[PDB]
Design a protein around this ligand. Structure first.
Ligand SMILES: [Fe+2]
Ligand SMILES: [Fe+2]
Ligand SMILES: [Fe+2]
Ligand SMILES: [Fe+2]
Ligand SMILES: [Fe+2]
Ligand SMILES: [Fe+2]
Ligand SMILES: [Fe+2]
Ligand SMILES: [Fe+2]
Lengths: 138, 91, 228, 228, 138, 91
DNA sequence: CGTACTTAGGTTAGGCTAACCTAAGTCAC
DNA sequence: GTGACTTAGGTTAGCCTAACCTAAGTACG
């Protein structure tokens, strides 16, 4: 369904930060349509693996390693969206759900090829900036 | 983090613009939250709420009240959670 | 190395073995996907329960109607992905398979139909393998391909000159080898000279346009050619 | 820590929980034997298939006739081993249970019958627990046992002076604790003063002949006494 | 059946050495009533774990660690036999099969107690010397 | 390793003593191989082939031929593999 | 030409983590 | 008093090693 649970939790926390929403476990439960117990257990696993920390106010804080992985996934997502709209010609409304699955399987090798093909894009088709282009070397 | 903290400080959320007394603005960003509803995205395309298009944001009062927007090809109602996730530059 | 979807990869591995003319046993899946004997039997028993295959009396795996449909769907996505990666994106020849092996699990039919138009109704992968299930998308007279012979069988039969037509998925799994093949020129649409050998288990010597190399019996079995 | 026989240990853990007046859930086996939830469910499903127990609607494990017979057989061997280790071999009080927990899996009925004669037809373990299934060997008026009360329940009911009668298998698993109990004198056939406490989840204070100590709620629940 | 496969393979190799027989995998197959494939696979596992080596003439050679573990099992076996005959009074013919199971579960702590109880025995009831009493400290 | 290499160098196997022309000997060791057959061990006890007892080993010729032994309470036939696994001191 | 062993492809028992669920609690402005 | 989260006990999918099997080979005095 999600393809990669960890990556979708990371990107969901990133989404909420972009919206200026407080990233709570309750928000992930809504967005990914999962039970509270599931989200708390998965967040605890990601805390143990050093990808985030639950603060005193209870908001989810990405670590250095957590943010680095979240950026990677979001970068792949928005480059996939650019490819799907500009080249493949998939319908504007269907692109996100396609790019949401593609973000988990794309290598950095393909990302660097897409950057050249698409003429060094800085935003997705929906105007959202593409982060972590520094980490690709472009 | 241009995505989280806009480099363009003039970028404002549609809900905040509406609550402040509306105005004409250029659509800049549609967040991943808005994209998750394809039917809504189709409706946004139809009436012309897409990056690089000017829209009129109607003034609104009270939280949990839907925001009216007028595009080039008609108008539509945004939920507060949706209007929060669309960013614009006011002209 | 993560499979992304276990079920889809078991199905496509059985398909690969049929294309190579190898008897699809659970032992073959264990080797190919580097999983334990007990793991493969338990996963095959789960797929049997869901009605995607059956274990015969002689213990060879048989795809059901649903199983074959799903296997074709995955392989179609795989070779359309390979076409996109080579023709449009420009990913290097030796890296394309491993990428495509992940993409096959996430691509919708919606995109497949868009890729068909973009790539001009492709019928074969960049490695010469035919693209199945194009009828299911909504798309040609199929080549007979009975004249095609395996490099190992050509070598044991006395060798000779032949045109490289297909490099199977099995061969694509080794990028370093695929780079070696590209250098010496054992690629689709190139002529090679297959040296004669006697008996199985012996490595076949082949001479390309830019030098020669050695193929293992299982690699030579997976390369198909038309003898001049 | 190796179980030696998985089936026999699952059966005896269900028996232990019944003796402690605890609902025998798979969750209880998981924490007791330090195994994963999925492991316990798969092993219980294998024992259910073999007809040694059944999972009720409320999920509590119910031993079959064969299951109870086997559980008693194992526990009998355990407490006869414990008797032998203390009375004849002279192994230290705190080390006997862990030893006996391995021996219970390898002892024949032949040896059991020889130990009954050697040990003078023993009816209770060195920790005061009755030895079941002596009928099956071929060997006594069974004490009433209704007057026995749990140290936790005595403490919540206002405490008082009481004679230590049983230390359950659950308590024996911690040798360091058993050494603490022996030192202060919380052993079978010794009088203790149980201090009054209010509500569950509170550690019960007890005063032996050679000082006092604290028992956890789950430990106090497993120690049985006759109040004066 | 065997309770511990490794320990029984080690003690079986030790048995054959005591009998002046060449310890081959074929001998273990007979004694433990197991197929040839089983014994070769289990011996390969024990070779990997550093308990024995297969020589050029194909006879099984215990390592330092293998011999140490084999002695430990045999010592427990013959002390168990002494206890079963002298103290418990189990019948002379039934003792070995009982002791063959007990050898896998006995701690060194009990061995040291049995040495005291049995008056420092040096042989089993069947006349076989008890090895590795040095390693008990007795 | 008194068990493998006997400290008492006069210890000999029953089969070897038989093949060398028999003799009277004291039973010393019955190996674990012999113990694995309870019915045989019973028969050994009955006729008096047990550690600390004197037995007469009958002279034999040819390998794969059973060894006749006389104990205090009668006699019995040992298989070559069994007679190999019983050790004695010739008196 | 048996004796010892390998090759090839299974099996059951007994372990694991990741990742989902519900039902019924607690904690807080 | 609703929103956020914990407590408690499950589940399926997908991996593992250890330890047994047969059937049909190869290698060697
Ligand atoms: Fe998106
Ligand atoms: Fe996704
Ligand atoms: Fe491929
Ligand atoms: Fe794949
Ligand atoms: Fe005990
Ligand atoms: Fe036990
Ligand atoms: Fe023995
Ligand atoms: Fe044994």
């Amino acid at each position: 369904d999600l393809i990669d649970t960890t990556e979708m939790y990371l990107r969901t926390i990133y989404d909420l930060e972009e919206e200026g929403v407080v990233p709570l476990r309750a928000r992930i439960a809504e967005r990914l349509e999962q039970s509270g117990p599931t989200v708390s257990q998965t967040v605890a696993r990601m805390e143990r693996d050093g990808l985030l920390t639950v603060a005193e106010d209870r908001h989810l804080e990405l670590t250095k390693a957590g943010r680095a992985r979240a950026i990677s996934v979001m970068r792949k997502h928005r480059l996939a969206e650019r490819l799907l709209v500009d080249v493949i010609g998939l319908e504007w409304e269907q692109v996100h759900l396609e790019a949401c699955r593609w973000e988990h399987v794309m290598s950095e090798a393909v990302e660097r090829k897409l950057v050249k093909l698409l003429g060094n894009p800085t935003t997705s088709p929906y105007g959202n900036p593409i982060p972590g282009l520094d980490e690709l070397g472009v | 983090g241009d995505s989280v903290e806009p480099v363009d400080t003039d970028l404002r959320r549609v809900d905040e613009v509406a609550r402040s007394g509306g105005g004409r603005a250029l659509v800049c960003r549609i967040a991943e939250h808005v994209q998750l509803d394809p039917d809504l995205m189709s409706e946004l395309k139809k009436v012309g709420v897409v990056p690089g298009n000017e829209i009129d944001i109607v003034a609104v009062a009270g939280v949990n009240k839907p925001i009216q927007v007028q595009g080039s090809e008609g108008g539509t109602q945004l939920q507060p959670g949706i209007a929060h996730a669309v960013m614009v530059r006011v002209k | 190395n993560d499979l992304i979807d276990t079920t889809e990869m078991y199905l496509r591995t059985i398909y690969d073995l049929e294309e190579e003319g190898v008897v699809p046993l659970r032992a073959r899946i264990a080797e190919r996907l580097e999983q334990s004997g007990p793991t493969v039997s338990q996963t095959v028993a789960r797929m049997e329960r869901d009605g995607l295959l059956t274990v015969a009396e002689d213990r060879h795996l048989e795809l059901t109607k649903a199983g074959r449909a799903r296997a074709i769907s995955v392989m179609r996505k795989h070779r359309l992905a390979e076409r996109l990666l080579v023709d449009v994106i420009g990913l290097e020849w030796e890296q394309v398979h491993l990428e495509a092996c992940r993409w096959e699990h996430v691509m919708s039919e919606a995109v497949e139909r868009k890729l068909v138009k973009l790539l001009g109704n492709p019928t074969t992968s960049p490695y010469g393998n035919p693209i199945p299930g194009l009828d299911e998308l909504g798309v040609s007279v199929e080549p007979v391909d009975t004249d095609l012979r395996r490099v190992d069988e050509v070598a044991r039969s006395g060798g000779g000159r032949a045109l490289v037509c297909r490099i199977a998925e099995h061969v694509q799994l080794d990028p370093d080898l695929m780079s070696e093949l590209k250098k010496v020129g054992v690629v689709p649409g190139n002529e090679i000279d297959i040296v004669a050998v006697a008996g199985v288990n012996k490595p076949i010597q082949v001479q390309g346009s830019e030098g020669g190399t050695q193929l293992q019996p299982g690699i030579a079995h997976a390369v198909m050619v038309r003898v001049k």
